[PDB]
Subunit: 328 residues, 4 copies
């Protein structure tokens, strides 16, 4: 995987973010999603890779663009592509927190090719955090006690993050019972997991159930940032089992370690759409010095080197024109 | 008012925010509110003012501490005091966005002594925005068209903020219909209005109904930051009408200009509790160089000088102790 | 001292910095110092203290300042870097420190040998002026957990520092030079992302006390020794109560008890950013100052970015008092 | 040029800056220079370009690596390359301000092929600045009067930067006489010129004489950032004249507009070595969340799109090992 591919990925997430931002607060999640898919597909076909989508918008049946197996790129090293054109379609449509655009790449087979099913998740940051510090079969109490001890703080100092859903009431009750602070996000458990390893996020642990593709994407970032995560797929009906079987997943009760979700040489890239726990959103900026531009905030990271790059980009634009000129 | 009072007010909002933060994500909004009220009252009584609460926790009937009319301070210049010990008690208990502590000071009679009722609000930023650019009796569309013209942008560039409530559906639908982007916050329309005049907030306009005290405090800040706002009190039942009559208000449908909400020499201070669209929340920080601390982010501003100070404070703390040691 | 005094002090350094900035790069050291002194004296006389200048310039030794309050000794520097500000060099600051009566070394205006390192856990003895430069740096490298080659040592670019510079480079350290501003240079050792690990050099005794006051709040260690070259200097020491001429002063001997330290950047430097002209459509035009205020008893540290409204169609000297 | 080349260039300047930093403050300007040359050369040969060095370390006579005419890169689109492995060799050896590493790319013939001679320079930033706002044959006073009018300020507000040299005494004295503020840098007039177009540099104008190669490099950045600049080569002896003649330059007194220095599609990249008035230098950082790393601060920009990216990169490193491990 050529060093060139890493920094090229940020252009993809930036262009998807700008397209998504033009639909921010338009009340239309489908238009938000399609703006991102279109921008990302077009940008990805300029990237010098021999790319196969292993996580994307869906099966070819249901998704015309960025479907599983689709071939993308202008030609280059062979890579598996995990992508999320718009993490937070509903978020973006109402301008909520934590919307992102996300692109990750691995050598062939480096990702768990996750089906569209739910996934139990537990994640903690820290480059020195050991394997086994968290696991999903241990109680919440016992996981937090270990985390607090490793971080060297009282339990009440820890900030635990989960989604505000009925399915999480027991995580929340238990975490609070042993003394921790638990904050709720409305959506965007990609940002919420990655935040555990993000300097100054204010989030120490993530515990929740959400999308499985999102779990792999977040593991890909934690692999570069440092941290630990365990995940397990959930299967509620026979169609979900069939989706897994079609992707080669047959050990349904497997507990996945972070190395099982994303392994080898991983590149992770993301751009903020709205302000979130991980990344700032797109903003309109005026200046006499340079004129008006849209500013994006992005991150690109690589697991092998552990180089993490924070990128602020200034994109020239006349806001006298319609904002949908940021589409494609 | 003696220039000393301005900067002393930040210490008050800081200690109240640290107390609030100890209850963040504990699912107990009464405990968060009380931690805030306690810390803020103890800190005020060390400020060198002869203070009279004109906006606070409530009437002496319902609020034992920081009630309307309470005298606070160690002695000094006579000021009316508008307080919100914790903007976002529910926010704070769940760790939502936009929780703040707030304190504003004016010469005697400078604030609208608002009864505790709903208030319709429209706000826009810009030191050169003219009085009349926004008006509650004009349509959303016409307000937006004027704002867009004044800012020199296409309508679709504008980001309108409002609270996610059924009472705002008509605002949201109309603003989208003429092409604007409308983002929703779950609570905290102090931050929401003030964001219109905060650099890099990504928010251009606020339209919505919320608390009347909060409207006054936001107007206090906008007086210092620059901008325009119009409010109108709303009355649901006859007891609310009596609360207005007791405060001297008989023109129930009076439209208040920003100068009617806050006039004269005004000091506005606020500290973030959680991350919001105005201020960052309190964070736990480690360093070998300094040891561990809590970081607060505050702003204090003054309407006469127009000076705005952004203050990042490092508060030493051993996080092996219980987080509630940050309470007063 | 009443907690009020700390945050009142930043206003003094800010006003002095704005006045200095109006003389930045004008080639007139005298006019810069006079602008700073005026602004500082005027602001100080609104602070609620019974202050006495024990380190100062007019703001002379023994001058009584303040509007009335707790008694404090005042160590001030209306403009650390008059030459600096006049030429637009790096590391010009305005500085105010306050202590309880007798908290500062009452230092004659003489030269002082200095060595300093940052870190709240640094023990007394980590630095010592009578150990070789090499043994000082080996201990600091051990304390910081790094190879010697990682350490960045700061000193002033002066012929009197050639032996320090050569000995530190010989043992493998990286030695960077500043043209002026050893207040900033010393405090940098305890300032996040200054990139300075150690300061070693000779400079003004007043400036050493001021830097020590800050390091007492930020955490670190420093040692100092006064230099006497002329009989006039020795008598200045005697008149101030100093008779042990070769005393090595620890950091607690320079600044003890409850200390407040305030500074504002004039030009960009190793510790603080300088004043800038800013334009915005939302907010209009303003001068931005960058300040720090700190207190030794609580170890609280406040960083303050202040936007001062101003129409830069008018002359800059309107920022004078 | 493929938009892939732009972001690949930052890796080159980052690697050269890290190598330079290992020699910072070691009092050896040659070893600093060689560390940077080595690292830039090696990195450059992994960039997918067919590159020809038009501005480099020297003529092949005197420079073995990165010489004028040298062919570099792994293969791709044809570009002319304007390099400065280490701007501020003496700066770096003393840890002074404004040391940078610099890589610029243009279409064939896009750069003035500058001889190793001195160059008179005047520069101002701002996208709307018209050609003629600055001119080397106008007085200093008249240049500054136009610049004050263009920026909408009193003359006393302007900050004029020059190098602290005897050859600049008349500039310094004239600029001060007409009321401007004139600050002095010891070295580093690449950074000093680009500062005029860099947000928050505090520098409005650069006026001085310095290296002609460094003038082309700074003009390349200003073409991306917006601004105007004029330059004239000066010749002190016969050997300097033939330096020009060898590179095809016989009009010895030509005044070059910025378009004459750098024209067409230009990419410009730089990384700070030491803190300066354009970029921050490399720093050693410790964190518990991430471990220890060297942090670099870079900028990459493009004249056709006007897109500018600020890049903060964290390079994992164990600082118990010798710092010379950052060499190539
Ligand atoms: Mn999605
Ligand atoms: Mn409240
Ligand atoms: Mn002085
Ligand atoms: Mn060079």
């Amino acid at each position: 995987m050529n060093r060139k591919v890493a920094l090229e990925a940020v252009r993809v997430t930036e262009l998807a973010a700008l397209a998504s931002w033009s639909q921010m607060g338009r009340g239309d999640k489908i238009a938000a999603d399609q703006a991102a898919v279109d921008a990302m597909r077009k940008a990805l076909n300029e990237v010098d890779i021999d790319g196969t989508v292993v996580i994307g918008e869906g099966e070819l049946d249901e998704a015309p663009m960025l479907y599983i197996g689709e071939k993308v790129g202008a030609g280059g090293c062979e890579v598996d592509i995990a992508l999320d054109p718009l993490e937070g379609t509903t978020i973006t449509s109402k301008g909520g927190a934590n919307a992102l655009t996300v692109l990750a790449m691995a050598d062939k087979g480096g990702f768990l090719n996750a089906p569209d099913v739910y996934m139990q998740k537990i994640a903690v940051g820290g480059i020195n955090a050991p394997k086994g510090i968290v696991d999903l079969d241990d109680s919440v109490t016992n996981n937090l006690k270990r985390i607090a001890e490793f971080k060297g703080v009282h339990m009440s100092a820890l900030v635990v993050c989960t989604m505000d859903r009925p399915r999480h009431e027991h995580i929340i009750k238990e975490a609070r019972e042993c003394g921790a602070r638990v904050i709720l996000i409305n959506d965007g458990d990609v940002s919420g997991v990655i935040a555990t390893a993000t300097e100054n996020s204010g989030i120490d642990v993530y515990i929740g159930t959400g999308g499985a593709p999102e779990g792999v994407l977040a593991a890909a970032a934690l692999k570069c940032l440092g941290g630990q995560m365990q995940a397990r797929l959930i299967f509620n009906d026979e169609e979900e089992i069939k989706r897994a079987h079609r992707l080669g997943i047959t050990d349904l009760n497997k507990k996945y370690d972070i190395d099982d979700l994303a392994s080898g040489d991983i590149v992770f890239a993301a751009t903020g759409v709205t302000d979130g726990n991980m990344l700032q959103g797109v903003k309109r900026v005026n200046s006499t010095r340079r004129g008006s531009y849209a500013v994006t905030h992005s991150v690109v990271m690589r697991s092998t080197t552990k180089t993490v790059r924070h990128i602020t980009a200034e994109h020239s634009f006349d806001f006298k024109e319609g904002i949908e000129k940021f589409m494609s």
